[PDB]
Write a protein that binds this ligand. Structure first.
Ligand SMILES: [Cl-]
Ligand SMILES: [Cl-]
Ligand SMILES: [Co+2]
Ligand SMILES: [Co+2]
Ligand SMILES: [Mg+2]
Ligand SMILES: [Mg+2]
Ligand SMILES: [Mg+2]
Ligand SMILES: [Mg+2]
Lengths: 227, 202, 227, 202
C-alpha cells in the first residue's frame, strides 16, 4: 500500500531528535510494556498473526492521523486489535464495549492468571524465532551482479517494495534464498515463498543526487524484471 | 466532530491505553494469555536483551582477527553459535565500516531491528524523520548526530525491508593499545552499531 | 518537496466523505472566514506573498501532524504566519506573544479600522486576479504530440511536479505559454517564467493498472526531457 | 510532551484560532489591514461567488450551440467576456463530457479550484481521500458518489498543478424538452461541474 508508513525519501519530517543512549528510555507508560506482551504473546500462539507480515499490515492500515500521533506502541495496539478481530479471535463489539469500560474506569482491575506452560511456549518463540527462510523447487531468476529494473507496481495490499525504489535500475548484491512472501502472507494467502535478493541502488539513480551514497534494499523476485 | 472531517481527529493516547487493557482483559478471560506470559515478554525485552550483546561481538572482532573474519564471512552461523539468535534476530548480517566505507542501517517502512543482538531500537530509529531522510540525505542526518564525513567516504545505507537484519561493525578507535576485550566492549556504543556514530578514542 | 501534501496515488486515506452540496457549509467558525480575509488582504498588497507560489510553500512546510489535523483554513493561517515572519512584515516573538494573549483571553477585543481605499485595492485583486502568464524570448522545447519522459528530480524546495508523475512517459497535450516558475517564485527567487505544458499520462504508465483512465497534468518545461 | 516526540502532538484548533486573531490584531495595529478590507473578502467568497455562475455557463452551452462551440474553442476569452474572471480564475478551461469520455477535476497537491466561476470548493475536494485516490482509482471514487461508469467509458482526470483551472461541462439530461435556459441552470449541480456526478433527468 502506498501509505503513510512508507516514508523513505519524504521531506518535511524535520530534525532527528538525538538523545544520548543512556537517556533513551524504553518505556514511559505501562500500557506500552503491555503492548509488547500482547504482540509476542499472541504471535507465539499464532493468534491473529503467525509472523510479522500480518503484524505489519495492521499498522499500515491505521488512519494516517493515528499513525503519526499514537506513539510507537500505539501502532502495536492497533495491529493486535485489527488482527484479532479480523481472524475471529475477538468480537468487535465486545472489544469496543470493553474498551469503553476501561476508558470510563481506568482503574478497573485486570483479571490475574498464572499459566507456566504458556510462559514456556512464549519463551520458545522468543528464543527459537520465526525464520521465514524456505526452499522452493524453482531456480532464482536473477544472479549476483545482474542489472535489474524494479517494477512499476502499486499493490493496494501489503508490500515490502518501498515507493522510493520503484522504477529503478539496481544491481543484485546477494541471493538470500526463498523467503515467505509478505504481499501474500500478510493477507493470510499462503507462505508462497519467493526468492529474496539484496539489491544496491546508487544515489544518482534513486534521487538524481551527486554524493557517494547508495542504498541496499532487500527485494522479492516479483518486484523486479530483467534488463 | 464534524462528520466531514473525522480524519482530522486523532485517537487520544488514553484510547490506546484503554484498548491495550481491554485486549489484555479479554485475552486473559478467554484463556489466550496469562499474567505471567505477558510479564515474561516484558522482562525479556526491557531487561534481558540489550546492546551489550552486540558490544561483546564488536570487542571480540577487534581482539581476535580470526573471529572477525569468520563473523564477516558467515555472520548468521557465528552469531547463532554465540547464542545471539531469536525472534527478529533469525538472520543477522554484519557490515564492516572501513576508512572509506561507512554503513548506516534503517527500517524505512517501520522499525525493524535485531532485538536478540542489539535490544530495542532507539526512539528516533522508529520515527519518521530518521526513516524518511537517511536514505536520501544520509550525510545531513549523520551531521545531526555529530558525524561529519568527508565527501570521499562512501555511505551505504541498509534498508531492512525483509526479515534480514543488519549490525554495523564500527572500527576500533586509536588510543586503545593495552585495553582488554572486556574493557573494549564498554566502549562500543549502541549508536555505533547502527552507523550513526563512530567510536571516540578514550 | 516530497511532503505530506503530495498525496496523489497514496493509499489509506479512506472513503470520501460525500455531502449533498446544499448541506456543504463553507465556514463553521469565524476564524476560518478571517483566514480567507488575511490571505486575500495580504496577497492583494504583496505582503508576505505576491501570488500563490509563496502561499503554497508555507502550507507544504507545515509539520505533517499539523497538516493532517489543522483543518483546511488552519493551513491558510500557517502560511500567512510563515510568510509574514519570513519577509520581515511581522516579528516572530511579537506574533508568539500576541498569540498567547488570545489563547489566554479569547474574547480580547480586536482593534477596528475603516480604510475604504484598502477595500478598493483588495477588490482589484479579487476581480483583476494575478495571472502568471508571461512572455519569454526562448522557444518551447516540446511540441504537441511529442512523447516526453518526466525527470527523476527531487526538489527539496517547492515544486508542482507531483511524485506520482515522476519518471513517466507522457504526451504533450498543449503548450500553454510561459508561466511564472513555482519552484523559484515560491522562494522569492524571481518569476523566471518557463514554458508550461499540459501532458497526458495513461493509467498503465502511471500505475501499471488496466482501466481506460488517464491523467492530464500541467508540467513546467524543466520537469521533462525528450525521448 | 516528551521532547523526543513533539511531532506526535498536533496544534489544537484553539491555537489556529488564536493565531488567526493575533495576525488580524497585529496587521490592523500596523496599518496593513482594516476591518472593512477583511469583511470585503469574506463577503466576496462566502456570498458573492458561487456555482450558479458555472451553472449559467452550462445552461447557455446547452441552449446555444454557437456559444457552446465558442466556449470550447476558447473558453478563456469567452468566460472573461461574461465577467467570470478574477483571482484563481484567470485561466479557466472547459472540458466536455461526452458519451464515452468522462472528465473529473482534482488538485492533488492542495485545493485549486476556479473561485470566480464555481465559488469555493467542496469540503471533500480539499481533503486527502479524494485527492489521493481519484488519480489512481477514479472509478472507485466515482462509485462513492453514486456514479458507476461502464468500463467502456474513458475517464480523464485533470490535475490542477498550475494556475490553469478546469470546469467540467456535463451533458444535458434526457427529459428536458421545453425547459427554458433559466430553468436548465437550476438543474446544474456543483458536483457535475467537477465531474463527480452526471445530471439526473427531472
Ligand atoms: Cl566506524
Ligand atoms: Cl455528464
Ligand atoms: Co521495521
Ligand atoms: Co490546490
Ligand atoms: Mg586505520
Ligand atoms: Mg532486510
Ligand atoms: Mg445522447
Ligand atoms: Mg493546472
Amino acid at each position: 500500500m502506498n501509505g503513510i508508513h512508507d516514508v523513505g525519501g519524504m521531506d518535511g519530517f524535520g530534525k532527528v531528535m538525538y538523545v544520548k543512549e543512556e537517556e533513551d528510555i524504553y518505556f514511559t507508560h505501562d500500557w506500552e510494556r503491555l503492548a509488547f506482551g500482547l504482540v509476542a504473546g499472541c504471535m507465539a500462539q499464532g493468534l491473529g498473526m503467525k509472523a510479522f507480515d500480518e503484524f505489519r499490515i495492521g499498522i499500515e492500515l491505521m488512519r494516517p492521523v493515528d499513525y503519526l500521533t499514537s506513539s510507537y506502541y500505539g501502532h502495536w495496539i492497533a495491529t493486535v486489535a485489527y488482527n484479532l478481530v479480523d481472524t475471529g479471535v475477538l468480537d468487535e463489539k465486545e472489544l469496543e464495549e470493553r474498551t469503553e469500560v476501561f476508558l470510563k474506569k481506568p482503574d478497573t482491575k485486570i483479571p490475574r492468571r498464572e499459566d507456566p506452560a504458556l510462559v514456556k511456549l512464549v519463551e520458545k518463540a522468543l528464543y527459537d524465532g520465526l525464520s521465514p527462510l524456505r526452499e522452493i523447487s524453482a531456480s532464482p531468476r536473477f544472479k549476483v551482479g545482474e542489472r535489474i529494473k524494479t517494477k512499476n507496481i502499486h499493490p493496494t495490499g501489503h508490500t515490502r517494495f518501498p515507493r522510493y525504489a520503484r522504477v529503478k535500475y539496481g544491481v543484485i548484491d546477494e541471493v538470500y534464498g526463498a523467503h515467505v512472501f509478505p504481499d501474500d502472507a500478510a493477507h493470510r494467502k499462503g507462505e508462497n515463498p519467493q526468492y529474496l535478493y539484496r539489491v544496491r541502488f546508487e544515489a544518482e539513480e534513486l534521487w538524481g543526487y551527486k554524493q557517494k551514497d547508495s542504498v541496499y534494499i532487500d527485494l522479492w523476485e516479483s518486484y523486479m524484471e530483467p534488463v | 466532530i464534524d462528520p466531514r472531517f473525522p480524519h482530522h481527529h486523532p485517537r487520544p493516547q488514553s484510547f490506546w491505553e484503554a484498548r491495550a487493557k481491554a485486549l489484555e482483559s479479554l485475552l486473559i478471560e478467554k484463556g489466550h494469555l496469562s499474567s505471567d506470559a505477558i510479564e515474561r515478554v516484558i522482562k525479556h525485552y526491557e531487561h534481558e536483551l540489550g546492546p551489550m550483546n552486540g558490544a561483546k561481538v564488536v570487542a571480540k572482532a577487534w581482539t581476535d582477527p580470526a573471529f572477525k573474519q569468520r563473523l564477516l564471512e558467515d555472520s548468521e552461523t557465528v552469531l547463532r553459535e554465540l547464542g545471539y539468535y531469536g525472534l527478529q534476530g533469525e538472520h543477522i548480517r554484519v557490515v564492516e565500516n572501513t576508512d572509506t566505507v561507512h554503513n548506516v542501517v534503517v527500517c524505512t517502512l517501520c522499525s525493524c531491528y535485531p532485538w536478540p543482538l542489539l535490544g530495542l531500537p532507539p526512539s528516533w530509529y522508529k520515527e519518521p524523520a530518521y526513516r524518511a531522510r537517511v536514505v536520501k540525505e544520509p550525510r545531513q542526518v549523520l551531521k545531526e548526530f555529530g558525524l561529519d564525513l568527508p565527501d570521499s567516504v562512501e555511505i551505504r545505507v541498509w534498508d531492512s525491508s525483509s526479515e534480514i537484519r543488519f549490525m554495523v561493525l564500527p572500527q576500533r578507535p586509536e588510543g586503545t593499545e593495552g585495553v582488554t576485550e572486556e574493557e573494549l566492549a564498554k566502549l562500543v556504543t549502541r549508536d555505533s552499531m547502527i552507523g550513526v556514530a563512530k567510536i571516540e578514542p578514550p
